[PDB]
Amino acid sequence: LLDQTSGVPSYFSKGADRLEEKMSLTVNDPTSATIYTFMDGDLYIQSTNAEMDKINKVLA
Amino acid sequence: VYVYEETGHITVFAHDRNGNLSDTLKEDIIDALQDYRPSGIMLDVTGVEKEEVNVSATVTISNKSRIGDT
Amino acid sequence: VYVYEETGHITVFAHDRNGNLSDTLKEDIIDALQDYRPSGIMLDVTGVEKEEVNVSATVTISNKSRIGDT
């Protein structure tokens, strides 16, 4: 992230920071976005193609 | 005077007898170090990080009659 | 010594009379260069690119009595 034109540490090398957003998998955290649901180790509901909540609400 | 060196920058810490660095004395130091600094290098002048230590002491004394302001 | 110069960087290639550069000698060169090197510019000390030529020579002699170890 330092200055590429100079390519060495210096007084003028440092600049802007970066916001990193890594994704991690959970088990039962309610705050996380659910992607799958299981009942006694068995899949509950399938979705063969893209999921769109607002679209599906219109179509229903 | 303490000189701290970094790649492409020089910073000079100075202080008077009191530990302070007046703006006028800062300007004088800058003007005097115009002749001294290397070409193509940046020079800065800053005060010394003064730390005023407050000391409340409790002194036990033997001669109680000599206790006074002086 | 060969001083190899770049923008904002100095590389001092140095060697002893054998072509080596020991760490003690490098530190001593560095300490001696503190007084002379320019302030604010990076400096590095490294040993020369030494090449180690082995030689095997077949030589013929006209007077063959002179052959020997001398």
Give which of B2, B36, B41 to mutate to test C binding, by max C Cβ within 10 Å: B41
* DSSP-assigned states of every residue in C15-54: --TTS---HHHHHHHHHHHTTTSPTTSEEEEEE-------
Q: How far apart are CA B3 and CA A9, in angstroms?
A: 20
Q: How far apart are CA C39 and CA B33, in angstroms?
A: 13
Resolution (A): 4.4
Q: How far apart are CA C29 and CA C34, in angstroms?
A: 9
Identify residue A60 by its one-letter amino acid code: A
Restricting to A residues 34-53, those with a Cβ less than 8 Å away from any Cβ of C are none
CA distances from residue C53 to A58, C2, C48 in whole angstroms, order as listed: 84, 21, 15
Method: cryo-EM
* DSSP-assigned states of every residue in chain B: -EEEEETTEEEEEE--TTS---HHHHHHHHHHTTTTSPTT-EEEEEE----PPP-------S-STT-S--
Q: How far apart are CA A18 and CA B13, in angstroms?
A: 33
Q: Does B5 touch chain A (CB under 8 A)?
A: no
CA distances from residue C41 to A40, A47, B44, C44 in whole angstroms, order as listed: 67, 63, 16, 10
**B8, A9: Cβ pair inside 8 Å?**
no
Tokens 């979705």, residue? A47
- Of chain A, the end-to-end C-alpha distance in Å amounts to 49
**Three-state DSSP class for C65?**
helix
At A38, give phi and psi (nearest 5°): -130, 145
Identify residue C43 by its one-letter amino acid code: L
Q: Does C6 touch chain A (CB under 8 A)?
A: no
Q: Does A56 touch chain C (CB under 8 A)?
A: no
Identify residue C60 by its one-letter amino acid code: T
User: What residues does B4 pair with on adjacent strands?
Assistant: B11
* DSSP-assigned states of every residue in A1-60: ---TTT-S--TTT-------------SS-TTS-----EETTEE----SS---HHHHHHH-
The answer to whether B8 touches B42, Cβ cutoff 8 Å, is yes
Q: How far apart are CA C35 and CA C20, in angstroms?
A: 24
Q: What is the dihedral of CA B35, B37, B39, B45, to 10 degrees?
A: -110
Tokens 């799958």, residue? A36
Q: How far apart are CA A19 and CA C58, in angstroms?
A: 71
